[PDB]
Amino acid sequence: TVKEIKSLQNFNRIAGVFHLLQMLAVLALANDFALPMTGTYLNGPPGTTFSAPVVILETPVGLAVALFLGLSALFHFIVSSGNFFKRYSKNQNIFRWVEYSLSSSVMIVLIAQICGIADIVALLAIFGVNASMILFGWLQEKYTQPKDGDLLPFWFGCIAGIVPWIGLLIYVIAPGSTSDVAVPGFVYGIIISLFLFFNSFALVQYLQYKGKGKWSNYLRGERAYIVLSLVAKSALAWQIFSGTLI
Amino acid sequence: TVKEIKSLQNFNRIAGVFHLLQMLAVLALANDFALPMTGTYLNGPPGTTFSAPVVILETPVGLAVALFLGLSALFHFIVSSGNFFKRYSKNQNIFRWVEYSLSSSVMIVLIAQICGIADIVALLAIFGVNASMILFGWLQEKYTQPKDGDLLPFWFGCIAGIVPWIGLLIYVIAPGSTSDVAVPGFVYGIIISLFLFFNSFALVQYLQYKGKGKWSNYLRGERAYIVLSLVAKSALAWQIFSGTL
Ligand SMILES: *C/C=C(C)/C=C/C=C(C)/C=C/C1=C(C)CCCC1(C)C
Ligand SMILES: *C/C=C(C)/C=C/C=C(C)/C=C/C1=C(C)CCCC1(C)C
Ligand SMILES: CCCCCCCCCCCCCCCC(=O)O
Ligand SMILES: CCCCCCCCCCCCCCCC(=O)O
């Protein structure tokens, strides 16, 4: 109903306000914590020798955390004018796909650096393939309705989506570890929680397109997504905050 | 026409054979050259320090070459029994997409390792995002025809596609170079040649769905893909062969 549409304008505006408040809070309180992006270039032939790692760029973590919070705050304020409905008049939500393409990619990169993924190409590619996951979900919503035909776009998203995490799992397990590799307790919590949040985002899409009575109303799904952006970003933002100090 | 389809059954079988002959050549003559995939794991917390880089897995390059050649050989022989024909009886070719999803990801990973990219997660991710490019192109053929709405999967693919080349450029330019860094001339040849070949694959897809007079025959596009797959995989296979042996 349009009455639900109206509640969504108010709902988004509040979601944005919470993201905005936390963004400012982090900006006020966070220290100057930075993580490295490096390159290990060749000293010659491909399989002969490598030049020692050079730090190309560093990531100001507090600003980066504020950044993905800022992206949600911003997009919710844009949406609050009723534009997402104006783009309907099932529904489709491009605003969300653009927002997530940016913010979920910003934050998966943070998680990687936290694990120890320093290489600049790795972090770039992870950002790219995470964006692909979001863009596949967008294509699901663009070309199909809640019917059998939505399978592929979704599952292509799952393929692009699962990879980043597999990379993290490699570093968490550390196949080449020589016993001096310790992963912090707060890191393990960040990975698990955020992984479980990413799974629920996939779950919303699935159920929404599967068509379960409850989720036959697109707007229940829309609202559930908005909460997940809010809860998952908050969770990571304050876990990293606490962990930076720990 | 169905006549053209039968011609394509032969054309694939011949292309497959050309891929197979080059595969077996490499397997016969190639060295035991291999490139490392590494992990540089943290010792402690994020901002402390790192443990020495460890080689997790090394890539047998000759075999990796035979792998993307063989995969093409394999799918061309499969197709040659007249399976893809059902899309005519613009069409679709998911044998292409399944094949390319694998074989071109194998070969882009090789190029990365040739450039000095060794981080196992980087190479994992590059592979993943290259597959995403192919899968976007698949979706272009699945849900669209020669109409405006065809563009979006294509452009999503272009984005996912360029990300690997951006990474390669980082290692070629070497922003943090301290003057001891050097890249072999043959690597510049590999990158430029294959980069143009990857661009032309997109060019075909574009012109085919753009509906340019010539390319309004879907099977003309198909023939282009068969030739490009052959030449681009060949070009890389032998440039690597020359440079590693
Ligand atoms: C702050 C916003 C966040 C963390 C949004 C994350 C979005 C997801 C993890 C979406 C994932 C999807 C799948 C895994 C399958 C394809 C459909 C999506 C885009 C809903
Ligand atoms: C051996 C086969 C190879 C090297 C195939 C390469 C395929 C591509 C580079 C396809 C690229 C595409 C775009 C860049 C846009 C999206 C559509 C595609 C898949 C045609
Ligand atoms: C399209 C993404 C490019 C990157 C920068 C985008 C900044 C966000 C702009 C808001 C997009 C909201 C949806 C707009 C829908 C439309 O294009 O008509
Ligand atoms: C390496 C030199 C070229 C290899 C030649 C491969 C030929 C494969 C195609 C088989 C031709 C027979 C096709 C049967 C029907 C027909 O000719 O129309």
Author numbering:
A (entry chain A): 5 to 93, 98 to 254
B (entry chain B): 5 to 93, 98 to 253
What does the paper say about this structure?
Well-diffracting HeR protein crystals were grown in lipid cubic phase, and the structure was solved at 2.7 Å resolution. The structure contains two HeR molecules in each asymmetric unit (designated as chains A and B) and the two molecules align very well with each other (RMSD = 0.361 Å). The most striking feature of the HeR structure is the very long extracellular loop 1 (ECL1) that is mainly composed of two antiparallel β-strands, which has never been seen in other rhodopsins. The structure also revealed that HeR forms a dimer. The overall dimer interface is 2260 Å2 as calculated by ccp4 program PISA,2 which is the most extensive dimerization interface seen in MRs. Compared to the classic bacterial rhodopsin (BR),3,4 the hydrophobic core architecture for ATR binding is well conserved in HeR; in particular, the π-electron system formed by two aromatic residues (W182/W86 for BR, F206/Y108 for HeR) at both sides of ATR, is critical for stabilizing the protonated polyethylene chain of ATR. Compared to BR, several key residues are missing in the HeR structure. In the Schiff base region, the key residue D212 is changed to S237 in HeR; and most dramatically the key residues for proton release, E204 and E194, are missing in HeR. In contrast, the ‘tunnel’ formed by TM1, 2, 3 and 7 of HeR is filled with hydrophobic residues, e.g., F88, V83, F72, V69 and V65 of TM2, L118 of TM3, and I9 of TM1, which occlude ions from passing through this tunnel. Our structure shows that H23 and H80 are isolated from detectable polar interaction to the proton transferring chain centered at E107.
